[PDB]
Coordinates of C-alpha atoms in Angstrom, one line a residue:
Chain A
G495 CA -14.4 -16.8 23.5
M496 CA -12.8 -15.4 20.4
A497 CA -16.0 -13.6 19.4
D498 CA -15.5 -11.7 22.7
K499 CA -11.8 -10.6 22.4
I500 CA -11.2 -10.2 18.7
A501 CA -12.8 -7.9 16.2
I502 CA -12.0 -6.6 12.7
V503 CA -12.1 -3.1 11.4
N504 CA -11.8 -1.8 7.8
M505 CA -9.0 0.8 8.2
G506 CA -9.0 1.5 4.4
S507 CA -12.7 2.3 4.4
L508 CA -12.5 4.5 7.5
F509 CA -9.6 6.4 5.9
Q510 CA -11.5 7.1 2.7
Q511 CA -14.7 8.1 4.4
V512 CA -13.0 10.4 6.9
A513 CA -10.8 11.9 4.2
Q514 CA -14.0 12.8 2.2
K515 CA -15.9 14.1 5.1
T516 CA -13.0 16.4 6.2
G517 CA -12.3 17.3 2.6
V518 CA -8.6 17.0 3.3
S519 CA -7.8 16.4 -0.4
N520 CA -9.5 19.6 -1.5
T521 CA -8.0 21.5 1.3
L522 CA -4.5 20.5 0.1
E523 CA -5.4 21.4 -3.4
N524 CA -6.3 24.9 -2.2
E525 CA -3.1 25.2 -0.2
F526 CA -1.0 24.6 -3.3
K527 CA -3.2 26.0 -6.1
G528 CA -1.5 29.4 -6.1
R529 CA 2.1 28.2 -6.2
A530 CA 1.1 25.7 -8.8
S531 CA -0.3 28.3 -11.2
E532 CA 2.7 30.5 -10.6
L533 CA 5.0 27.7 -11.5
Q534 CA 2.9 26.9 -14.6
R535 CA 3.2 30.5 -15.8
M536 CA 6.9 30.5 -15.2
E537 CA 7.3 27.5 -17.5
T538 CA 5.1 29.0 -20.2
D539 CA 7.1 32.2 -20.2
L540 CA 10.4 30.2 -20.0
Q541 CA 9.6 28.2 -23.1
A542 CA 8.7 31.4 -25.0
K543 CA 12.1 32.9 -24.2
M544 CA 13.9 29.6 -25.2
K545 CA 11.8 29.8 -28.4
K546 CA 13.5 33.1 -29.4
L547 CA 16.8 32.2 -27.8
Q548 CA 16.8 29.3 -30.3
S549 CA 16.4 31.6 -33.4
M550 CA 18.6 34.6 -32.5
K551 CA 21.9 35.5 -34.1
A552 CA 24.9 35.7 -31.7
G553 CA 25.5 39.1 -30.2
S554 CA 24.6 41.4 -27.3
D555 CA 20.9 40.6 -27.3
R556 CA 21.3 36.9 -27.5
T557 CA 23.9 36.8 -24.8
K558 CA 21.7 38.9 -22.5
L559 CA 18.6 36.7 -23.1
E560 CA 20.6 33.5 -22.5
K561 CA 22.0 34.8 -19.2
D562 CA 18.4 35.7 -18.4
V563 CA 16.9 32.3 -19.3
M564 CA 19.7 30.4 -17.5
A565 CA 18.8 32.6 -14.5
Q566 CA 15.1 31.8 -14.7
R567 CA 15.7 28.0 -15.1
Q568 CA 17.7 27.9 -11.9
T569 CA 14.9 29.7 -10.1
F570 CA 12.2 27.5 -11.6
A571 CA 14.1 24.4 -10.6
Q572 CA 14.8 25.6 -7.0
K573 CA 11.2 26.6 -6.7
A574 CA 9.6 23.5 -8.3
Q575 CA 11.8 21.3 -6.1
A576 CA 10.6 23.1 -3.0
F577 CA 7.1 22.8 -4.3
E578 CA 7.0 19.0 -4.9
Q579 CA 8.7 18.5 -1.5
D580 CA 6.2 20.6 0.5
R581 CA 3.3 19.0 -1.4
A582 CA 4.5 15.5 -0.5
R583 CA 5.4 16.5 3.1
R584 CA 2.1 18.3 3.7
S585 CA 0.2 15.4 2.1
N586 CA 1.9 13.0 4.5
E587 CA 1.4 15.2 7.5
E588 CA -2.4 15.3 6.7
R589 CA -2.9 11.6 5.9
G590 CA -1.0 10.9 9.1
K591 CA -3.3 13.2 11.2
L592 CA -6.2 11.3 9.8
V593 CA -4.8 7.9 10.6
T594 CA -4.2 9.0 14.2
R595 CA -7.7 10.3 14.7
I596 CA -9.0 7.0 13.4
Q597 CA -6.7 5.0 15.7
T598 CA -8.0 7.1 18.6
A599 CA -11.5 6.0 17.7
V600 CA -10.5 2.3 17.2
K601 CA -9.0 2.3 20.7
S602 CA -12.1 4.0 22.2
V603 CA -14.5 1.5 20.7
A604 CA -12.3 -1.4 21.5
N605 CA -12.1 -0.4 25.2
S606 CA -15.8 0.3 25.3
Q607 CA -16.5 -3.2 24.1
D608 CA -13.7 -5.0 25.9
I609 CA -11.9 -6.1 22.7
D610 CA -8.2 -7.0 23.1
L611 CA -7.4 -7.3 19.5
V612 CA -8.7 -5.5 16.4
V613 CA -7.4 -6.9 13.1
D614 CA -7.5 -4.9 9.9
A615 CA -10.1 -6.4 7.5
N616 CA -7.6 -6.3 4.7
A617 CA -5.7 -9.1 6.5
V618 CA -8.8 -11.2 7.1
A619 CA -9.9 -13.6 4.3
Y620 CA -12.9 -14.8 6.4
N621 CA -14.6 -14.4 9.7
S622 CA -17.6 -16.0 11.3
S623 CA -20.6 -13.7 11.8
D624 CA -20.2 -13.6 15.6
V625 CA -16.8 -11.9 15.1
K626 CA -17.6 -8.2 15.2
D627 CA -16.7 -5.8 12.4
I628 CA -16.5 -2.6 14.4
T629 CA -15.9 -0.3 11.4
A630 CA -19.3 1.5 11.7
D631 CA -19.0 1.9 15.5
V632 CA -15.5 3.4 14.9
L633 CA -16.6 5.9 12.2
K634 CA -19.2 7.4 14.6
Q635 CA -16.4 7.9 17.2
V636 CA -13.9 9.7 15.0
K637 CA -13.4 13.2 16.3
Chain B
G1479 CA -8.9 -21.3 23.4
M1480 CA -6.8 -18.9 21.4
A1481 CA -6.6 -16.0 23.9
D1482 CA -3.1 -15.3 25.2
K1483 CA -2.1 -17.7 22.3
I1484 CA -1.9 -14.7 20.0
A1485 CA 1.0 -12.2 19.9
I1486 CA 2.1 -9.3 17.8
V1487 CA 5.5 -8.6 16.2
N1488 CA 6.6 -5.6 14.3
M1489 CA 8.4 -7.1 11.3
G1490 CA 9.0 -3.6 9.8
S1491 CA 10.9 -2.4 12.8
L1492 CA 12.9 -5.7 13.1
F1493 CA 13.9 -5.8 9.4
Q1494 CA 15.2 -2.2 9.7
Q1495 CA 17.2 -2.7 13.0
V1496 CA 18.7 -6.1 11.9
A1497 CA 19.5 -4.5 8.5
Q1498 CA 21.4 -1.7 10.0
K1499 CA 23.2 -3.9 12.5
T1500 CA 24.3 -6.3 9.7
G1501 CA 25.0 -3.3 7.4
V1502 CA 23.6 -5.2 4.4
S1503 CA 23.3 -1.9 2.5
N1504 CA 26.9 -0.9 2.6
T1505 CA 27.6 -4.4 1.5
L1506 CA 26.8 -3.1 -2.0
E1507 CA 30.3 -2.1 -2.9
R1508 CA 21.1 -5.3 -8.6
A1509 CA 17.8 -7.2 -8.1
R1510 CA 19.3 -10.7 -7.7
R1511 CA 21.3 -9.3 -4.7
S1512 CA 19.1 -6.6 -3.1
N1513 CA 16.2 -9.0 -3.0
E1514 CA 18.3 -11.9 -2.0
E1515 CA 19.8 -10.1 1.0
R1516 CA 16.2 -8.9 1.8
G1517 CA 15.1 -12.5 2.0
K1518 CA 18.2 -13.6 4.0
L1519 CA 17.2 -11.2 6.8
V1520 CA 13.5 -12.3 6.7
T1521 CA 14.5 -15.9 7.2
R1522 CA 16.8 -15.0 10.1
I1523 CA 14.0 -12.9 11.7
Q1524 CA 11.4 -15.6 11.2
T1525 CA 13.7 -18.2 13.0
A1526 CA 13.9 -15.8 16.0
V1527 CA 10.1 -15.3 15.9
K1528 CA 9.5 -19.0 16.0
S1529 CA 12.0 -19.5 18.9
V1530 CA 10.3 -16.8 21.0
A1531 CA 6.8 -18.1 20.1
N1532 CA 7.7 -21.6 21.3
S1533 CA 9.4 -20.2 24.3
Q1534 CA 6.3 -18.3 25.4
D1535 CA 3.8 -20.9 24.1
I1536 CA 2.3 -18.6 21.4
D1537 CA 0.3 -20.3 18.7
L1538 CA -0.1 -17.3 16.4
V1539 CA 2.1 -14.3 15.9
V1540 CA 0.6 -11.5 13.8
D1541 CA 2.5 -8.7 12.0
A1542 CA 1.7 -5.3 13.8
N1543 CA 1.1 -3.9 10.4
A1544 CA -2.2 -5.9 10.2
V1545 CA -3.3 -4.8 13.7
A1546 CA -5.4 -1.7 14.2
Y1547 CA -5.3 -2.0 18.0
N1548 CA -4.3 -4.4 20.7
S1549 CA -4.7 -4.0 24.4
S1550 CA -1.8 -4.7 26.9
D1551 CA -3.3 -8.2 27.2
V1552 CA -1.9 -9.0 23.8
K1553 CA 1.9 -9.2 23.9
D1554 CA 4.2 -7.5 21.4
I1555 CA 7.3 -9.8 21.3
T1556 CA 9.3 -7.5 19.1
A1557 CA 11.9 -6.7 21.7
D1558 CA 12.2 -10.4 22.6
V1559 CA 12.6 -11.4 19.0
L1560 CA 15.3 -8.8 18.5
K1561 CA 17.4 -10.3 21.3
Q1562 CA 17.1 -13.8 19.7
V1563 CA 18.0 -12.8 16.2
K1564 CA 21.3 -14.3 14.9
Chain C
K1325 CA -11.0 -22.1 15.3
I1326 CA -8.2 -20.0 13.5
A1327 CA -6.5 -20.8 10.2
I1328 CA -4.3 -19.1 7.7
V1329 CA -4.5 -18.9 3.9
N1330 CA -1.9 -17.6 1.4
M1331 CA -4.0 -15.1 -0.6
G1332 CA -1.0 -13.9 -2.7
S1333 CA -0.2 -17.5 -3.7
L1334 CA -3.9 -18.3 -4.5
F1335 CA -4.3 -15.2 -6.5
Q1336 CA -1.2 -16.0 -8.6
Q1337 CA -2.3 -19.6 -9.3
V1338 CA -5.9 -18.7 -10.1
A1339 CA -5.0 -15.8 -12.4
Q1340 CA -2.6 -18.1 -14.2
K1341 CA -5.2 -20.8 -14.7
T1342 CA -7.9 -18.3 -15.9
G1343 CA -5.4 -16.5 -18.1
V1344 CA -6.7 -13.1 -17.0
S1345 CA -3.4 -11.5 -17.8
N1346 CA -3.3 -12.5 -21.5
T1347 CA -7.0 -11.7 -21.8
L1348 CA -6.3 -8.2 -20.6
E1349 CA -3.4 -7.8 -23.0
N1350 CA -5.7 -8.9 -25.8
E1351 CA -8.3 -6.4 -24.7
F1352 CA -5.8 -3.6 -25.0
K1353 CA -3.2 -4.6 -27.7
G1354 CA -5.3 -3.1 -30.5
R1355 CA -5.8 0.3 -28.8
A1356 CA -2.2 0.0 -27.7
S1357 CA -0.7 -0.4 -31.2
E1358 CA -3.0 2.4 -32.5
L1359 CA -1.1 4.5 -29.9
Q1360 CA 2.4 3.2 -30.7
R1361 CA 2.3 4.0 -34.4
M1362 CA 0.2 7.1 -33.5
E1363 CA 3.2 8.1 -31.6
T1364 CA 5.9 7.7 -34.2
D1365 CA 3.6 9.5 -36.6
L1366 CA 3.7 12.5 -34.3
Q1367 CA 7.2 12.0 -33.0
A1368 CA 8.5 12.2 -36.6
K1369 CA 7.5 15.8 -36.8
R1370 CA -0.4 16.4 -30.0
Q1371 CA -3.3 17.5 -27.8
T1372 CA -5.3 14.6 -29.0
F1373 CA -2.5 12.2 -28.4
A1374 CA -1.9 13.1 -24.7
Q1375 CA -5.7 13.3 -24.1
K1376 CA -6.1 9.9 -25.7
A1377 CA -3.1 8.1 -24.2
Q1378 CA -4.4 9.3 -20.8
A1379 CA -7.8 7.8 -21.2
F1380 CA -6.2 4.5 -22.4
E1381 CA -4.0 4.4 -19.3
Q1382 CA -7.1 4.9 -17.1
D1383 CA -9.2 2.3 -18.9
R1384 CA -6.5 -0.3 -18.5
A1385 CA -5.9 0.3 -14.8
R1386 CA -9.6 0.4 -14.1
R1387 CA -10.1 -2.9 -16.1
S1388 CA -7.2 -4.5 -14.3
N1389 CA -8.6 -3.6 -10.9
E1390 CA -12.0 -5.1 -11.9
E1391 CA -10.5 -8.4 -13.0
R1392 CA -8.3 -8.5 -9.9
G1393 CA -11.3 -7.8 -7.7
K1394 CA -13.3 -10.6 -9.4
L1395 CA -10.6 -13.1 -8.7
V1396 CA -10.3 -12.1 -5.0
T1397 CA -14.1 -12.5 -4.7
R1398 CA -14.0 -16.0 -6.2
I1399 CA -11.1 -17.0 -3.8
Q1400 CA -12.9 -15.5 -0.8
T1401 CA -16.0 -17.6 -1.7
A1402 CA -13.8 -20.7 -1.6
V1403 CA -12.1 -19.7 1.7
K1404 CA -15.6 -19.4 3.4
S1405 CA -16.7 -22.8 1.9
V1406 CA -13.6 -24.5 3.3
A1407 CA -13.8 -22.5 6.7
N1408 CA -17.5 -23.6 7.2
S1409 CA -16.7 -27.3 6.3
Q1410 CA -13.9 -27.4 8.8
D1411 CA -15.7 -25.3 11.5
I1412 CA -13.0 -22.5 11.3
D1413 CA -14.2 -19.1 12.6
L1414 CA -11.4 -16.9 11.4
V1415 CA -9.0 -17.1 8.5
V1416 CA -6.0 -14.7 8.4
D1417 CA -3.9 -13.9 5.2
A1418 CA -0.6 -15.7 5.7
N1419 CA 1.2 -12.6 4.6
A1420 CA 0.2 -11.0 7.9
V1421 CA 1.4 -14.0 10.0
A1422 CA 5.0 -14.4 11.3
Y1423 CA 4.4 -17.7 13.0
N1424 CA 1.7 -20.3 13.5
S1425 CA 1.7 -23.5 15.4
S1426 CA 0.2 -26.8 13.9
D1427 CA -3.2 -26.1 15.6
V1428 CA -3.5 -23.1 13.2
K1429 CA -4.1 -24.8 10.0
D1430 CA -2.8 -23.4 6.6
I1431 CA -5.8 -24.1 4.3
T1432 CA -4.3 -22.8 1.1
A1433 CA -4.4 -26.2 -0.7
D1434 CA -8.0 -27.0 0.4
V1435 CA -9.2 -23.6 -0.8
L1436 CA -7.5 -23.8 -4.2
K1437 CA -9.5 -27.0 -4.8
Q1438 CA -12.8 -25.2 -4.2
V1439 CA -12.2 -22.1 -6.2
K1440 CA -15.1 -21.6 -8.7

C-alpha cells in the first residue's frame, strides 16, 4: 500500500550533484571575476590616496585630492552595492533554475512509477526498505 | 491504510498571509516580542489545520516545504485552512 | 504504519546529556585565547593573524558539523530500533508535520530511551 504511493528523494543531494555537474558555481565566479578585480583595484588605489590625504598640509593640493577621494568613494560605494546585489540576485536565479529542473525530474519519475507523494529525505528519520528512495532514478532524468 | 489520509499544507504561505492580515509587523510601534507574535500566529494556524484535518478525516498533514512532489490525489488544504483561521 | 519523532528535541536533549557543546568549547578555548591576546597585541599597534583566524574559524565549524552529524546518526539508530520493534514503516520529523491523529504515534520518548 504505502510502499506503492509514497517515496522519498534526497533533494539536497540532487542539488549538490547537479550543481557540480553543471559547474554553476564556477560559471557565476567567471561572470563576476572581472568586476570583482576592478573593485579590488579601486579600493587599493583609494587607500593609497587616503594615505597621502592623511599626511598633507592644508592648501590647494590637499583640497583637490580630498574632493577627488570623496568622489571615488561615492563611485566605489555605488558600484560595490550594485555588485553585491547582482551577485546575490544572479546566484538566486541560478540556484532556482537548478531546483526547477530537478523538480521537473522528480515529477517525471513519480508519474512513471505511479507515486502520489514524494517526501524530502531530510524530513524522514526512518523508512522501511520497501519504501523507494528515488534519488538515483531522478538524477538520471534531470535535463 | 494511510492513502487519502495524508494531506499537505503550506505553512510558509499561511504564516505570511495571516501575518499581513493581522498586521503584526506594524504592531511594533525585540526578541521577546517578535518571536512571541510569531508563535501566536503559529498556534492560530495549527488550530485551523486541526479543524480542517478532522473535517476532512485526514490523519496526517505534512508541511509542503518537506514535499518534493505530490500528485493531485494528495490534497493541499492550504486554502481551506486559510478560511478557518481566526 | 506511520509515526512522527521530534528530531530537534531529541538532538537538544542528547547533546546536553553528552555535553558535546562544552567539549567543543574546551577543544578550542586554547587556540581561541591565543587569538584573543594575539589580537590586542596587534591591535595595540597582520597577514598571519587573518590567515590564522580564518583556519581556526573553519576548524571549529568543521568540527561542530562532525559532532552534530555523529549525534544525528546515534538518534537515527534509535529511531530505527523503535520503528522495527513497533512495526512502523515510516517515521517523519515532527517539524515537518502540522497535524497528526492518534493513529500516527509520536515516538520521541521511546526513541530517547534507546539512544546509544
